[PDB]
Amino acid sequence: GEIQWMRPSKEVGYPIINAPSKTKLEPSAFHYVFEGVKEPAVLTKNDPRLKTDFEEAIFSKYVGNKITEVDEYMKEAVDHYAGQLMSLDINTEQMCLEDAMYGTDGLEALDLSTSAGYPYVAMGKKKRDILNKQTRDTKEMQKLLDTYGINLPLVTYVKDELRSKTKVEQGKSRLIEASSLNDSVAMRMAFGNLYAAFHKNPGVITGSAVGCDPDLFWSKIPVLMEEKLFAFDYTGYDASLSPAWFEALKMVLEKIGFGDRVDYIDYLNHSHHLYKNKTYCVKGGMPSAVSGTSIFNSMINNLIIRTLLLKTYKGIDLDHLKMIAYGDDVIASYPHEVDASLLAQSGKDYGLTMTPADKSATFETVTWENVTFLKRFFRADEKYPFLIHPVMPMKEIHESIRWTKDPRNTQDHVRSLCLLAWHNGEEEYNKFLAKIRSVPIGRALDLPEYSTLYDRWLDSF
């Protein structure tokens, strides 16, 4: 990805956009009951904590575009991936406006809380004024589509979340690149069935895990993997994507029956952005908050890994490449050991910056003992080995519980954490519950005991 140009929005016919400048995050009732070193990310150029130019920092993710066209290895990757997907017998029909708006089997309704994007954000019109979850009205939406059309600029906000002291000091805040309600609706109508098919088929066929439920899915994953696992981390995945990778994606879509609407992918590739009083154009890079962001990054990941394996290990059997992606995150396998360090090398020629799995200093062998997916480990249950526990380290949960965005969501927030934590064992979970109950706020919460969560789990299969 690379920003072609940036200038005052007025100069190109656009209004100034208001992006919140004050974090809604602040110390929670457990701020001092648990350890933590994370704080709210920088949201404005004036934040006292900054140690470098903010603007420069948030846009530096666009490391440029390495490759220009789709080479021979990429084409092979496309054919193989498209071939697998073809077996899912995905419905290629467009999705009706109603379902694209309010949902259907395999596709959740549009999120009413998230932004309505441009121009609604500048007209003050919110999403709650356009759709009725119970009326399932599409009349208001239809007029809006006919009025403002599609391919609208993407509204950019800085994401309000916790970050390391380092990332805070270097202005490394992540950005929300929200598509207009019009594009989301249009794109969900164009790819709605593709999304549903993926959400319903997390595994090694779609090579995707978007829409999965870690509590149940973790027991299916091992069975799907080949003998030797391999993995690695990406540095600025989304932003590093070159235009060729988007073209590769269109070929897959074309081969599986969506050639009809590959133009929507162009909208992702060559994108239009609004930030504050500036507007900029990007060539390459996947927008962060577009309908399909997660699924398309995953499809592209499948193309990337297949390509690197073909470039590096000629004669490799992609039919025995068993991988599952979730955006840039990925867990993969092959009957034979492969060199991640080597793959990382080939990766640089494709505009991808790959590093050791889980922040290691060197490329070590990936095993069931140390592999993580979605920041979760894999641990067979002591009583029933065939049931696999998705284990997220307590550190993350601790960091999270020390802050709050709305005292009215304390019950949910803390309950969410409990569903993640208990997998660390009864001893750990109880220590967690006791610390929570060492202050008034925690003692008033309704939290599940270990026995309850363990039984709920066994009963969910």
Task: Kindly tell me which of 271 and 293 has the beta carbon lying closer to Na ion.
Answer: 271
Task: Kindly tell me which of 153 and 214 has the beta carbon lying closer to Na ion.
Answer: 153
Task: Kindly tell me which of 23 and 271 has the beta carbon lying closer to Na ion.
Answer: 271
Which residues inside 363-422 make contact with Na ion, applying CB under 5 A?
Answer: none
Return the structure tokens found at 80: 């193989």
User: Cβ of residue 269: shortest distance to Na ion, in angstroms?
Assistant: 6
For the CA atoms of 298, 246, 267, 110, the dihedral, rounded to the nearest 10 degrees, stands at: -10
**After which residues is the backbone of the chain broken at C–N > 2.5 Å?**
none
243 lines the binding site for Na ion (CB under 5 A): no
Q: How many residues bind Na ion (CB under 5 A)?
A: 3
Could you give the 3-state DSSP secondary structure of residue 6? strand
285 lines the binding site for Na ion (CB under 5 A): yes
Q: What angle do CA 258, 262, 267 make, to 5 degrees?
A: 145
User: Cβ of residue 443: shortest distance to Na ion, in angstroms?
Assistant: 49
Task: Kindly tell me which of 296 and 334 has the beta carbon lying closer to Na ion.
Answer: 296
Q: Which residue blocks in 124-220 are alpha helix, DSSP H?
A: 139-148, 165-169, 181-200, 214-217
Task: Kindly tell me which of 150 and 387 has the beta carbon lying closer to Na ion.
Answer: 150
233 annotated ligand binder: yes
User: Cβ of residue 299: shortest distance to Na ion, in angstroms?
Assistant: 16
115 close to 19: Cβ distance less than 8 angstroms: no
User: Cβ of residue 265: shortest distance to Na ion, in angstroms?
Assistant: 10
Helix axes 243-253, 293-312, angle to 10 degrees: 100
282 lines the binding site for Na ion (CB under 5 A): yes
User: Cβ of residue 430: shortest distance to Na ion, in angstroms?
Assistant: 48
Query: Quick one: 139 exposed, middle or buried, by C-beta within 10 A (0-12, 13-18, 19+)?
Result: exposed
User: Cβ of residue 264: shortest distance to Na ion, in angstroms?
Assistant: 13
Q: Rounded CA gap, 443 and 169, in Å?
A: 36
271 lines the binding site for Na ion (CB under 5 A): yes
Task: Kindly tell me which of 203 and 285 has the beta carbon lying closer to Na ion.
Answer: 285
Could you give the 3-state DSSP secondary structure of residue 43? coil
349 annotated ligand binder: no
Residue ranges of the binding site for Mg(2+) = 233, 328
Binding positions for Na ion, rule: CB under 5 A:
271, 282, 285
